Enzyme design. Structure first.
Site, PDB file in Angstrom:
ATOM      1  N   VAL A   1     -34.725 -11.656  23.058  1.00  0.00           N
ATOM      2  CA  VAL A   1     -33.330 -12.037  22.813  1.00  0.00           C
ATOM      3  C   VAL A   1     -33.308 -13.425  22.236  1.00  0.00           C
ATOM      4  O   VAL A   1     -34.017 -14.306  22.736  1.00  0.00           O
ATOM      5  CB  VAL A   1     -32.577 -12.035  24.179  1.00  0.00           C
ATOM      6  CG1 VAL A   1     -31.109 -12.502  24.040  1.00  0.00           C
ATOM      7  CG2 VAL A   1     -32.682 -10.684  24.894  1.00  0.00           C
TER       8      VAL A   1
ATOM      9  N   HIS B   1     -59.680 -15.554  19.959  1.00  0.00           N
ATOM     10  CA  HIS B   1     -59.485 -14.096  19.905  1.00  0.00           C
ATOM     11  C   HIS B   1     -58.032 -13.734  19.531  1.00  0.00           C
ATOM     12  O   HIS B   1     -57.749 -12.550  19.295  1.00  0.00           O
ATOM     13  CB  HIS B   1     -59.936 -13.404  21.175  1.00  0.00           C
ATOM     14  CG  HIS B   1     -59.003 -13.616  22.306  1.00  0.00           C
ATOM     15  ND1 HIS B   1     -59.325 -14.445  23.354  1.00  0.00           N
ATOM     16  CD2 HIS B   1     -57.768 -13.102  22.512  1.00  0.00           C
ATOM     17  CE1 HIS B   1     -58.279 -14.420  24.164  1.00  0.00           C
ATOM     18  NE2 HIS B   1     -57.309 -13.637  23.676  1.00  0.00           N
TER      19      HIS B   1
ATOM     20  N   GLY C   1     -51.814 -10.134  27.277  1.00  0.00           N
ATOM     21  CA  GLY C   1     -50.633 -10.741  26.658  1.00  0.00           C
ATOM     22  C   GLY C   1     -50.471 -12.215  26.979  1.00  0.00           C
ATOM     23  O   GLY C   1     -49.670 -12.884  26.330  1.00  0.00           O
TER      24      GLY C   1
HETATM   25  C1  LIG Z   1     -58.627  -8.762  31.346  1.00  0.00           C
HETATM   26  O1  LIG Z   1     -58.293 -10.082  31.856  1.00  0.00           O
HETATM   27  C2  LIG Z   1     -57.426 -10.866  31.122  1.00  0.00           C
HETATM   28  C3  LIG Z   1     -56.982 -10.512  29.847  1.00  0.00           C
HETATM   29  C4  LIG Z   1     -56.090 -11.392  29.217  1.00  0.00           C
HETATM   30  C5  LIG Z   1     -55.562 -11.038  27.864  1.00  0.00           C
HETATM   31  O2  LIG Z   1     -54.375 -11.278  27.650  1.00  0.00           O
HETATM   32  N1  LIG Z   1     -56.342 -10.504  26.896  1.00  0.00           N
HETATM   33  C6  LIG Z   1     -57.773 -10.308  26.968  1.00  0.00           C
HETATM   34  C7  LIG Z   1     -58.011 -10.879  25.529  1.00  0.00           C
HETATM   35  N2  LIG Z   1     -59.341 -10.547  24.993  1.00  0.00           N
HETATM   36  C8  LIG Z   1     -59.741 -10.375  23.732  1.00  0.00           C
HETATM   37  C9  LIG Z   1     -61.057 -10.106  23.769  1.00  0.00           C
HETATM   38  C10 LIG Z   1     -62.137  -9.845  22.728  1.00  0.00           C
HETATM   39  C11 LIG Z   1     -62.054  -8.535  21.917  1.00  0.00           C
HETATM   40  C12 LIG Z   1     -61.804  -9.889  21.219  1.00  0.00           C
HETATM   41  N3  LIG Z   1     -61.483 -10.079  25.141  1.00  0.00           N
HETATM   42  N4  LIG Z   1     -60.381 -10.374  25.824  1.00  0.00           N
HETATM   43  C13 LIG Z   1     -56.901 -10.317  24.649  1.00  0.00           C
HETATM   44  C14 LIG Z   1     -55.686 -10.257  25.629  1.00  0.00           C
HETATM   45  C15 LIG Z   1     -55.034  -8.930  25.428  1.00  0.00           C
HETATM   46  O3  LIG Z   1     -55.538  -7.878  25.809  1.00  0.00           O
HETATM   47  N5  LIG Z   1     -53.905  -9.085  24.740  1.00  0.00           N
HETATM   48  C16 LIG Z   1     -53.103  -7.954  24.236  1.00  0.00           C
HETATM   49  C17 LIG Z   1     -51.749  -7.622  24.911  1.00  0.00           C
HETATM   50  C18 LIG Z   1     -50.982  -6.527  24.099  1.00  0.00           C
HETATM   51  C19 LIG Z   1     -50.911  -6.762  22.555  1.00  0.00           C
HETATM   52  C20 LIG Z   1     -52.279  -7.094  21.919  1.00  0.00           C
HETATM   53  C21 LIG Z   1     -52.885  -8.282  22.707  1.00  0.00           C
HETATM   54  C22 LIG Z   1     -54.224  -8.660  22.019  1.00  0.00           C
HETATM   55  C23 LIG Z   1     -55.374  -7.846  21.993  1.00  0.00           C
HETATM   56  C24 LIG Z   1     -56.536  -8.340  21.381  1.00  0.00           C
HETATM   57  C25 LIG Z   1     -56.620  -9.636  20.803  1.00  0.00           C
HETATM   58  C26 LIG Z   1     -55.507 -10.475  20.906  1.00  0.00           C
HETATM   59  C27 LIG Z   1     -54.333  -9.961  21.499  1.00  0.00           C
HETATM   60  C28 LIG Z   1     -55.694 -12.624  29.781  1.00  0.00           C
HETATM   61  C29 LIG Z   1     -56.170 -12.958  31.066  1.00  0.00           C
HETATM   62  C30 LIG Z   1     -57.046 -12.089  31.711  1.00  0.00           C
HETATM   63  C31 LIG Z   1     -57.590 -12.457  33.091  1.00  0.00           C
HETATM   64  N6  LIG Z   1     -57.194 -11.453  34.105  1.00  0.00           N
HETATM   65 CA   LIG Z   2     -35.846 -15.711  22.783  1.00  0.00          CA
END
Ligand SMILES: COc1cc(C(=O)N2C[C@@H](n3cc(C4CC4)nn3)C[C@H]2C(=O)N[C@H]2CCCC[C@@H]2c2ccccc2)ccc1CN
Ligand SMILES: [Ca+2]
Length: 223
Positions: A57, A40, A175
């Site tokens: 930084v 993903h 993230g």
């Molecule tokens: C909700 O729970 C969690 C969540 C996380 C976690 O990081 N996630 C959940 C991940 N995810 C993707 C998908 C499907 C729809 C394709 N389902 N879950 C993506 C990431 C997140 O939201 N990342 C942001 C942070 C900001 C910038 C853009 C990033 C981003 C968004 C989308 C794709 C990649 C990167 C990791 C651990 C847990 C467990 N608690």
């Molecule tokens: Ca750095």
């Protein structure tokens, strides 16, 4: 990472930041030219950032290397997040040292109760949003398949495991995905998904790396 601690600069030498103008995912360096992340986390224009602590930084230990190729698992299903794994090849090989190092692939699957280290630059709040600049860590156990399945009825495949705390308060978060779950110096999981963060009975869900070692090795050996 919610309810974790500050790792300390370059103490998780295999942890990488995937940057497409901003940090959006974690990853794990598995050799000098390959990073393991979540499928993903796929996107074009990825720059792999190694040796990072503060991602905002330039502190002097970073290696910034553009991805030359991304290989999402052929069976990744983005609706179920089954086979949530991807390989990223670096345009040039990373220079390996004490602060930038590869993480060994597992030879076998880690059991429930195994203590692991989860790390990332994800959100540090369970309600609200605060993105840290420095790498955050969480020591967490792998949860039993039965407790994982009970927490997430009809969602846990044989390619996933839960880790964390059913009482909540300590979890990976927005993230951190794509990043490592390392247990006894082996990469056992990839931060994959969840339902919110650090909520009661909703632990993080992780890609089961031991199921992919043959695909990872074969892919690296041919690309
Ligand atoms: C909700 O729970 C969690 C969540 C996380 C976690 O990081 N996630 C959940 C991940 N995810 C993707 C998908 C499907 C729809 C394709 N389902 N879950 C993506 C990431 C997140 O939201 N990342 C942001 C942070 C900001 C910038 C853009 C990033 C981003 C968004 C989308 C794709 C990649 C990167 C990791 C651990 C847990 C467990 N608690
Ligand atoms: Ca750095």
């Amino acid at each position: 990472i919610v309810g974790g601690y500050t790792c300390g600069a370059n103490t998780v030498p295999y942890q990488v930041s995937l940057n497409s103008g901003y940090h959006f995912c974690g990853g794990s360096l598995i050799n000098s030219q390959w990073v393991v992340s979540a499928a993903h986390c796929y996107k074009s224009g990825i720059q792999v950032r190694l040796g990072e602590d503060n991602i905002n930084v330039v502190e002097g230990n970073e290696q910034f290397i553009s991805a030359s190729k991304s290989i999402v698992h052929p069976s990744y299903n983005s609706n179920t997040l089954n086979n949530d794994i991807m390989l990223i090849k670096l345009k040039s090989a990373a220079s390996l040292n004490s602060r930038v190092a590869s993480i060994s692939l597992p030879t076998s699957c880690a059991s429930a109760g195994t203590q692991c280290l989860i790390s990332g630059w994800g959100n540090t709040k369970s309600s609200g949003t605060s993105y840290p600049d420095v790498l955050k860590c969480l020591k967490a156990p792998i949860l039993s398949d039965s407790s994982c399945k009970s927490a997430y009825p009809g969602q846990i495949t044989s390619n996933m495991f839960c880790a964390g705390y059913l009482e909540g308060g300590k979890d990976s978060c927005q993230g951190d995905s794509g990043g490592p779950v390392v247990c006894s110096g082996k990469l056992q999981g990839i931060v994959s998904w969840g339902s919110g963060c650090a909520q009661k009975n909703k632990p993080g869900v992780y890609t089961k790396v031991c199921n992919y070692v043959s695909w990872i090795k074969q892919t690296i050996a041919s690309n």
